[PDB]
Amino acid sequence: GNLDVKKALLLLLVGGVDKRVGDGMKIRGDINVCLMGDPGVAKSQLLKAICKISPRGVYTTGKGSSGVGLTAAVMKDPVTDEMILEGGALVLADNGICCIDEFDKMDESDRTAIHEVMEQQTISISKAGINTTLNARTSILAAANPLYGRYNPRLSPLDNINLPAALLSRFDILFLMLDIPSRDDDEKLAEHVTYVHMHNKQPDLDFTPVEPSKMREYIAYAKTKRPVMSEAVNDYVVQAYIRLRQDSKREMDSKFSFGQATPRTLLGIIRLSQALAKLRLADMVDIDDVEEALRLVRVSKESLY
Amino acid sequence: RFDLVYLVLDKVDEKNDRELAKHLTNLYLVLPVEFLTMYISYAKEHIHPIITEAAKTELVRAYVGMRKMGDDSRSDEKRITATTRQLESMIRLAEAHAKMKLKNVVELEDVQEAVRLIRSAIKDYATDPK
Amino acid sequence: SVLAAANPIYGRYDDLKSPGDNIDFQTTILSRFDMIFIVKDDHNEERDISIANHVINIHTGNANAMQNQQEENGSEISIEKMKRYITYCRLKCAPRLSPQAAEKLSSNFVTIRKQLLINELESTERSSIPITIRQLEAIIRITESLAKLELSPIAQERHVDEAIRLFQASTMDAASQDPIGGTSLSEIRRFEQELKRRLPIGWSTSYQTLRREFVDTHRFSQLALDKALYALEKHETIQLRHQGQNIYRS
Amino acid sequence: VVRDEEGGDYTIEAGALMLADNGICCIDEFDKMDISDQVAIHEAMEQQTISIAKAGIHATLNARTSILAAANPVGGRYNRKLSLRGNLNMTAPIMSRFDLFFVILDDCNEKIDTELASHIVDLHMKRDEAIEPPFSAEQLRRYIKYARTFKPILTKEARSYLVEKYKELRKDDAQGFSRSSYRITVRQLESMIRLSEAIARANCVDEITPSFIAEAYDLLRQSIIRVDV
Amino acid sequence: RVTLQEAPGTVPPGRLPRHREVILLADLVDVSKPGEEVEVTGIYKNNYDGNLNAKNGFPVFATIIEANSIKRREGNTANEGEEGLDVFSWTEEEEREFRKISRDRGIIDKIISSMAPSIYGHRDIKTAVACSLFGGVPKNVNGKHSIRGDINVLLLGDPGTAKSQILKYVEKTAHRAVFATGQGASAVGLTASVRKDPITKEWTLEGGALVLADKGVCLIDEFDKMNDQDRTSIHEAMEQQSISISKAGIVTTLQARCSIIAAANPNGGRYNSTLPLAQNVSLTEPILSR
Amino acid sequence: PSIYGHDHIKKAILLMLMGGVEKNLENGSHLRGDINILMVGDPSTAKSQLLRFVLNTASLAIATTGRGSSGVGLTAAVTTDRETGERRLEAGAMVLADRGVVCIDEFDKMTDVDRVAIHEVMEQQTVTIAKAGIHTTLNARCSVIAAANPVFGQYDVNRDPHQNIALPDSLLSRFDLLFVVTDDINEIRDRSISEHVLRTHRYLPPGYLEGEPVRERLNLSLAVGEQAGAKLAKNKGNYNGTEIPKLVTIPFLRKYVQYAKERVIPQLTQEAINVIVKNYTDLRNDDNTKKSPITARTLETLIRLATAHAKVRLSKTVNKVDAKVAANLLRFALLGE
DNA sequence: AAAAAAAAA
Ligand SMILES: Nc1ncnc2c1ncn2[C@@H]1O[C@H](COP(=O)(O)OP(=O)(O)OP(=O)(O)O)[C@@H](O)[C@H]1O
């Protein structure tokens, strides 16, 4: 299952609108998606599969290994102890896909780093006069869980991520995977798992005409095509943002208060429409892309209940 | 102890949201150069304006005026908003208003600009009462 | 072997306060210990006179003679001889039990466990001092040490009775020491009213009659026995003589 | 006390009071000190020394200082209805340490604030150097260092007036209430003696006149006038 | 040979101390102790050294001090009453005068009245302090019973009662005196502590404040404001007269014959005459009984 | 045999010592194969003794205490060899137990920091060391058994199970089986256990008298050591007669374990699959109170329990009886009889 | 490089 999560992963792979705008204003094609769900939903396995299929993917976590954040991998490395270092940098943060599990686990240092890599902002932490900043242009994909370990009937922002709301508002797309006990879905899940176990392989019950190396080729092929923006959707996206602020007029109704006012919502809508044009379409952005981005946002919010 | 303070409150309205949408979409689709920096350096180095006796009366009148508003027809002893910090803020703002345009002595325009720009923030500094 | 000295919270035990909030040790730590003794201070001026006499004697001017006679009359042995004897006994002997002793220990353990349950069902909180199978092993070890003292290759009832006596002392002093911690009190005043009203000074009545009367009424047996023995604990108008039959009013 | 990690320093570091030896320490915002300093101070002033014993190093340091502090009454504005103890949150034992108190209030009088603003403006632009004190700073320092070389004594009538004044000051304050007003100790008598000596020094006189005692008593009484108002 | 630093009371504030090396010949061995401020009269000498020249680049010479006399100056800073290396030593005629004046009637009254001659009243405090600083006789019964022979004194009262002055006089009076105060002392500061020597790199023992108070008095001020963790570490010092350490594989017991004199203030800053002592102070029975 | 009761605990230990097989896929990466068991209970209920027995009877095991361990030194250490003059990694406690079992006591008293070092092992059974210029992944495919006390002195049956256990749910979800034990006071059980414990203490080693303590013995007479089927000397196992049901000795049981862990690799079938899916669907939708929440990973536990039970009876196929017994054991461990 | 004691936050 989880077709919409995989669709969001596809939209993440292609990337959004990029290569700057007039008069030097900065825009990034990277998409930031945070996944929420209870333990035991195979979100970690999905992240591992994404890292496998993405050649630029990197997996990190809060400590466990020290030389992965805020420090260069060559610090104090040479036998001469030449103190080779770039200063403030991350692991392959240039055009990389950073994947993190237990997003609430990391300490203040890695939290500061992930806040510093916001919106293609370079890391300029200095210690001994070094300022060789790493130009971080990366897409952030993280998975986390509430501290309760289960969804709660109370106000959903009280569960949130246990992270500052400023960091939460940065993310383009928020998904919530809540486990609902039912017969007609758990039967299918158990049947799928047991049929996988019986064959000791990926079963023929799966029906996929396309292959992982084929996706590896086609993602580069579709990235090469690189459609650009068409102006005819400006009025439609403006009125959609007007209706989004109309929703912001009802965010005080509470119990799913995440429908807050943020220009980054509109920017992410534009980027997602651009990515929808990029994934298959030629050098043209369709209103259907805007509609699909809107539907994806509504589905993202609808998981709150 | 700050010299000034400013507040931004984004509230959802049709007109301003429409204007921001149009403006940012057009950006998505008269500006000087380091000349500004050299002008700033020249003003900081070669310009040392002073205030004049004419503006002293206006300063005193403004201080009294905000002292006048600090009390009303009730003996509650309303909050004393006319602090000496207000005086020093007005003085510095007026002197800086003489700093640009390469002037050497202050005029009235300096003091009215200073008092307007200092009381605009105060008028938005109130809480839910009044 | 661990020999530990400790002081309760708030200095003196403060028996008016509940036993639960007088000891800060958890259940896990207390179970490993198996001989806990509560040394409470007392005042009756006779033990006090005796202690003062003993200290004034134990000053160096007198004890240096008297203690010497303890090695001259054979009452006590020197420390080094005790060390030699104890290491010899540790090396040589290692006793064993007998089936009658096992039966006695089993019955005693069942009895104390049932008594603990009886206290717990009334106090409606968990006991601050637990009784577990570790305690049964403890009594077994105490019996073995008592038999080991006299180099006996087998342990018999003579040592078992002393071990059970010591365990009962160390149990009633700490665990079962006032388990109540101080229908509520409404029946207590009601029960205090009738005995003053119905039974004057100098006369007496059978326990069976009162128990029958206040089981027929609403008081029931559980409330009466506690009230009766606490009116006795007050000890200013109620006296028991002639076994548990004669309820004499002093 | 500080030490480098696995480095044999065991060295003490000097606070502001340590640096202010034989001088004047000026503390601003006295209200928000913490427990350690709040309990070290009332030993620092009265005994003129500080003692510490931590982690194997012990010492007794000199802290001969004169302290001057400023405070802000709780709630922002001083409540004239209450007293010094009611308005201030700082503790009673620290109160007895100090020798003098000064409370200064602002108001909304239109006459005063206009003069205040005018005086500020005059020194800002017109006469930034042309202020008129009766004496120059050099003359002030000359007189200060000349008067510092005098040690006054006390005479018979001075002692009699002093003991009478101390008796009166102990009596009139203790007559107010019990278990609510406790402010006069031997420290007050010592402070009165010190103020008399300082005033005698100011006039460059090797003896003390009961008028100086009267002035010191007036200052101390006005310290208790201020708490009443 | 020993390393000599600068006295913290003599160094200008905020600066660093200066180190020197002192060499003690025969009869001077173990006279000085770690942490004890001393005054040494000696001879200044200089000698050649290799790596000092190597690292400085100039013909510089190392200097050491060959000690000739040592005088202890810990606590008792009053150094004007009499002269000599040890002011606590007596001649034969001084002993004869001691015996002559020790036989007059009412000598205890004169001794009590001669203590702190500039503090008025408080006769009971003077008597208690005299009885505390004269001490008793430790008792040993058959080598298996020990009885403490020192007296502890606790002072409690209102401010402005010259408790600190009396404590300072006691510090000036006793042969061995250690002054602590309030929050300025820690639990492991009074007791002996465990430290790693930077040279030989292994755990060792460092003498605490109480060890310096052995055969002497330990004076504590502001006893109430000291934290409970820093207060519960002197029970053995007041009662068992022994300090036991089991830390970092080091198991040793240290002797401590010290008399503790403490001052404090009651709750609220003043003493409520109409209340019991249990509601006047926050101390408990185990500390009050000692 | 000297522990009274806890029969289901014994069955769980038996199934854990010879757990299921590990799975590797060209696309599915790796699947965990063995079983981990955690027990929580009030003091003096014979947990540490069972842990010592498991140490003694296992092919390979390492004893670890929560307080007396450091997580960084638990996995690997950096030591400089005296001869070569270079620094090389020294194997930690858990790495030595590869393809073994690790027992940890006072688990709830063990420092929180080092807990993450355990979780990594519970994640992919591999520890990564990146320090001082060494970057290596070390295999550690061991099983872990632990016993911990509740937060209070005694278990409160009226409280939230999460409330009684100090460990976070993140690692508690990893353990396949959670057991809660309590010493309910009952005079019948008290008498039975008293008789049993007294019976145990009245024991004497063969050929040695009761008047003197145990003395140390020398090594074997032979420094290096080394008619069939008609004797059954130690094959039947019943050394002493106490019950109609049989018993087996420790050496024969260990030989059985050695044979089973190597000679048989069972394959599951659809008949047990139907029972497994039916009981998972039933247990998930019973909709009543339970000790712990259940999720998709429990079906994996059922599969490997059925595999272990197929291994026990030495069959290459999994029958529905193994599914039934696994479901019964899980219901006991989560519902209670 | 890794374990263990101390004072300040
Ligand atoms: N939809 C699913 N299909 C198949 N297996 C699933 C599914 N959801 C969960 N699983 C199972 O869950 C396990 C992986 O989920 P896992 O618990 O590691 O993820 P998680 O939700 O990030 O939790 P945690 O933080 O506890 O690791 C696997 O054993 C997998 O078989």
Ligand SMILES: Nc1ncnc2c1ncn2[C@@H]1O[C@H](COP(=O)(O)OP(=O)(O)OP(=O)(O)O)[C@@H](O)[C@H]1O
């Ligand atoms: N007879 C006396 N009684 C009390 N104080 C006296 C007496 N004679 C003189 N004084 C003076 O009174 C002051 C009392 O000292 P101090 O303020 O330290 O007392 P304290 O109550 O012990 O102090 P604190 O407890 O605050 O440390 C000293 O300055 C001392 O000179």
Ligand SMILES: Nc1ncnc2c1ncn2[C@@H]1O[C@H](COP(=O)(O)OP(=O)(O)OP(=O)(O)O)[C@@H](O)[C@H]1O
């Ligand atoms: N069912 C039992 N059969 C035999 N002995 C038992 C039984 N239950 C408890 N015991 C005895 O209880 C004692 C306590 O042992 P142990 O400390 O290992 O138990 P535990 O439950 O693990 O306790 P803890 O929580 O303190 O570790 C042992 O001497 C053991 O023999």
Ligand SMILES: [Mg+2]
């Ligand atoms: Mg996960």
Ligand SMILES: [Mg+2]
């Ligand atoms: Mg145990």
